[PDB]
């Protein structure tokens, strides 16, 4: 929550607040850099290059 002024933190299947209360079997962090307009493309079932 201290990462950048206006970070977009979008959770599917969970809540942003509830992550601290949960146990996760297998966790993977996938890091990349894209254009801002292409950020919305990073979501389940979206269309884009």
């Amino acid at each position: 929550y201290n990462l950048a002024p206006f970070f977009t933190f979008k959770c599917y299947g969970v809540s942003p607040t509830k992550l601290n209360d949960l146990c996760f079997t297998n966790v993977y962090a996938d890091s990349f850099v894209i254009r801002g307009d292409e950020v919305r493309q990073i979501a389940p079932g979206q269309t884009g290059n």
Binding site: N20, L22, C23, F24, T25, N26, V27
Partner: protein, 48 residues
């Protein structure tokens, strides 16, 4: 991440209280929340 219950390598910063048995309590086991009585079980679970 997978929330399907299994051995959980990654967990949130939650302090674990003592384990009380044979009494009606609320319980939170690795994110599994419920209400009931925990008793020593004779079930022959596999170690995994």
């Amino acid at each position: 991440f997978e929330l399907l219950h299994a051995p959980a390598t990654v967990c949130g910063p939650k302090k674990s209280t003592n384990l009380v048995k044979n009494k009606c309590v609320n319980f939170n086991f690795n994110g599994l929340k419920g209400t009931g009585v925990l008793t020593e079980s004779n079930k022959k679970f596999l170690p995994f």
